[PDB]
Symmetry: D2
Subunit: 121 residues, 4 copies
Amino acid sequence: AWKGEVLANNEAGQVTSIIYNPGDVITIVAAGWASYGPTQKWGPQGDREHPDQGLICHDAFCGALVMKIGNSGTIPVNTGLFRWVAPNNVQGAITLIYNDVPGTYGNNSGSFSVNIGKDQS
Amino acid sequence: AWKGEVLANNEAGQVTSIIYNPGDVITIVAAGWASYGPTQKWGPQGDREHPDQGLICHDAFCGALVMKIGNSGTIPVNTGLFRWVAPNNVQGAITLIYNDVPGTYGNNSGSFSVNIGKDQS
Amino acid sequence: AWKGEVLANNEAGQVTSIIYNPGDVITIVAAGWASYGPTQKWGPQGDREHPDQGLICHDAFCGALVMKIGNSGTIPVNTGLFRWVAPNNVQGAITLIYNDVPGTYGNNSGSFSVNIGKDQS
Amino acid sequence: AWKGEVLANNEAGQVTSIIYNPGDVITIVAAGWASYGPTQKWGPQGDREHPDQGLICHDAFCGALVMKIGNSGTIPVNTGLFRWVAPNNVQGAITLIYNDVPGTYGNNSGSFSVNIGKDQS
Ligand SMILES: OC[C@H]1O[C@H](O)[C@H](O)[C@@H](O)[C@H]1O
Ligand SMILES: OC[C@H]1O[C@H](O)[C@H](O)[C@@H](O)[C@H]1O
Ligand SMILES: OC[C@H]1O[C@H](O)[C@H](O)[C@@H](O)[C@H]1O
Ligand SMILES: OC[C@H]1O[C@H](O)[C@H](O)[C@@H](O)[C@H]1O
Ligand SMILES: [Ca+2]
Ligand SMILES: [Ca+2]
Ligand SMILES: [Ca+2]
Ligand SMILES: [Ca+2]
């Protein structure tokens, strides 16, 4: 299992120690408070009131936690995934990222604390 | 495992099918949007800026998801619990509740969706 | 999880720390060599050639590993059980026992090494 | 998970669907009766009284269940492995084999039933 922090101002994202292999079932739980700019802070689902101005993930709100598995596209994580299997045969290392517009991560603050484990299969 | 919804307006909370027994390890993932009165909505960690005016759980913000195991006191859940083990002596059915001040749930709205399962131990 | 030894000459059985509760899924793996009397030894399935002369469990051979769950009758374990659910209405502490005729354990030797865990549910 | 049978007279062994990846935790439970030649049968720990005359796995008795993981040497399985992690730099598909001397499998009989699953990690 992996336990770590994902900083909201890190545009490259946080590489974890988890490799997602074919057939793996995983569980993620995320908590904490971060902002894409404003003084207010939001949790791992982000800000449902902010429009999408070119987010790295169009299926999650600005300020949400998202991930990539290997060379996949971005996949929403939000507060977590329960006993989840990756669709479409994706595989590889798990990278966690804060959902913002590329080039605008410099004014971001806060972080999420994230647990990832593999389930029985 | 159990999956279900917990309404923000329900002072009685939502009884699940999960009975927590001594030594159990559990994982909970919660998601969704609710409000304790305002037009804005918050996720399962609640509103970090709002004062405690007599919440059912003083260890979580107003608007957070909390639980009871049997006749325990309230326990914060927030966005979830990863491979968690209860304090000594706690046992019984898990009831999920929205954290507000008793008598004031009448202006609350929305709901959280919650998954619970038992882990290997 | 519990790991320990079950001595072949212990007629009372070895009480483990595992309490089997309704809904639990368990895995057991047993190993080792034991005898009910002869100089030869057998593994946890026991001796398929020996007759049942009053065994504490009639559904397993003499010299097999069996168990009781609380006050239940005996249940065969043999080499182990994979992600197993107990009959309804049995619960309580798991006791592990070598299968011999009562009164006749004094000439037994050897032991089984046994591991028990609870699985995801 | 994988469930199947390992035949005592199959010298090549049985390639399963389980790929052991770095960091995996696995559980194997084996049961049944087989022989390496004699009329008598033994369980998955084989025959502790039989000399090693060139076994594929010198770390297990003749008639035991063993495995290979990818490019590994043979590894004893016996009655099973509980929540087991492989040595460093062992990975690949799990092949299960009956322990006998090469060229002497033709007179073997019986089989073991085997369950393999991945555990939480
Ligand atoms: O839409 C995203 C965008 O939102 C605000 O304008 C922030 O100030 C920017 O840094 C950027 O995060
Ligand atoms: O502090 C709790 C309190 O918050 C606001 O005042 C709401 O209008 C009330 O219904 C109550 O929820
Ligand atoms: O069948 C049970 C019986 O088998 C042999 O006779 C042993 O010597 C006895 O002690 C008893 O274990
Ligand atoms: O030691 C191995 C050897 O044991 C006996 O001799 C069997 O007859 C042979 O087929 C071979 O299995
Ligand atoms: Ca920004
Ligand atoms: Ca209210
Ligand atoms: Ca005896
Ligand atoms: Ca042979």
